[PDB]
Design a protein around this ligand. Structure first.
Ligand SMILES: [Cl-]
Lengths: 274, 274
């Protein structure tokens, strides 16, 4: 309960529901922890891949100070989201106290080509909880290859599939079930697509003659992420176009998951150096 | 009780390794804990589905006394197994102190032909760690329907997919991975085919106006059972006919599994009363 946590939380656009701010404050606290793990300093110019509604971008903008800058990239449209769209969220940030430190490029895929950041350099390119959304591990590796042109390293943070408490097993199960099903038969309806781990990142590094360095683990079990993911997995077995037999077979995994808690996994961090 | 541990262990034919007896005593002890949970009484006639080399059968035969009897069913051949075949194991049991209390039917699947037990009635039918081999949950249900005619209740024991310690997570993942891979690439070599939980059994009971009664959990983390199941899961990437893509998405779930311990899961027990 830092003044600073509350300061940054209060800079965000909120939905109108009862628990909006308490949910937001947890999300914001987790991004401060991640920023602390990465040792983000005042003055830096940072590029964030997978910015979504700006929870991390807002935190980084505060951290880098009035002479720093943070550019968020997302493949999503600004009109995506409810109750607030991603553009409503960003325009709120841009019209606020950190606005001059912030830029956002929506509908943007930087593996295609550097496009809107084409001639810039950054002190840091970062990804937090966007790794699992990549099409494949090779696709993540190609993004990194491109980023080598704009920075000397990429910092990452993503859920760990090594649960540190038993009440995190539900979340591990939701992730595995989504990842396996996507692997079995890909879908455009899919949320989680590739379950990247620190060993995947070490292998990407080895394949490309880079280095991967593990950083500190970030614990944040009170994040609503687990509950959201377990519901997403439940939703997906109905929404996916699965055979009866495959559906029926996934059923016991959903049952088990319902009994394995609702705390959020720990989050691993690390750095790919080119 | 457990007071009969060494007596029963000593009835068992051992393979040639230094720690065969130590491994056997752990297995016999696990079956005694299951028998204790089920509350087997003197004089009972019992039918056991998936008796394997008779680790449970012998325990049961001891407990029912010379007034009871234990019939073991296995789908495998007498010549199955190394360094001890199932028939070596069983012929030894039949020649020993408990042999008059025991009967075995190899190459027997009562889902396919009920002939081998024609006209027989039993006090209970039991299944310990044979639920996951069933072709499907409906196939299990159908067998129970057939057993309703010839006994009062069925007692079950099986791996619980709710870890009680973090070091059991690897065993859980082994089971999950195997169950979804069997959904898409079944093999004869595969032995985890359908995952079955207490919720599965409750639903089966609901569908047929039977009662399911959860019993007590059996903890035995020192069993080698997780170690072997984890090894099987790694190996099935090689043995199963998988697409290159599925392979390379599962390959790193396996590496993830490697960091989540090698202790065995708890065992759930319960009764379907017809
Ligand atoms: Cl053992």
């Amino acid at each position: 309960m830092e003044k600073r946590l509350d300061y940054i939380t209060d800079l965000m656009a909120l939905g109108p529901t009862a628990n909006a701010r308490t949910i937001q404050r947890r999300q914001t606290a987790h991004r401060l922890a991640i920023a602390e793990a990465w040792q983000v300093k005042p003055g830096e110019k940072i590029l964030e891949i997978g910015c979504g509604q700006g929870d991390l971008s807002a935190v980084l903008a505060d951290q880098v100070g009035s002479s720093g800058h943070v550019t968020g990239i997302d493949i999503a449209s600004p009109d995506y989201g409810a109750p607030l769209t991603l553009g409503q969220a960003w325009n709120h940030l841009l019209a606020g106290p950190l606005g001059d430190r912030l830029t956002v490029h929506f509908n943007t895929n930087l593996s295609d080509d550097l496009g809107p950041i084409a001639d810039q350099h950054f002190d840091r390119v970062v990804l937090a909880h966007s790794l699992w959304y990549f099409a494949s591990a090779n696709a993540l590796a190609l993004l990194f290859k491109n980023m080598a042109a704009v920075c000397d390293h990429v910092d990452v943070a993503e859920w760990s599939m090594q649960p540190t408490a038993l009440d995190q097993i539900g979340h591990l199960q939701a992730a595995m079930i989504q990842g396996l099903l996507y692997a079995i038969a890909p879908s455009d309806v899919a949320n989680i697509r590739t379950l990247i781990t620190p060993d995947t990142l070490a292998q990407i590094a080895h394949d490309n003659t880079w280095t991967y360095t593990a950083g500190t683990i970030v614990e944040d079990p009170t994040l609503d992420d687990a509950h959201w993911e377990i519901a997403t997995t439940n939703a997906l077995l109905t929404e996916l176009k699965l055979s009866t037999d495959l559906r029926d077979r996934v059923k016991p995994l959903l049952e088990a998951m319902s009994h394995n808690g609702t705390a959020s996994l720990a989050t691993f961090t690390g750095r790919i150096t080119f």
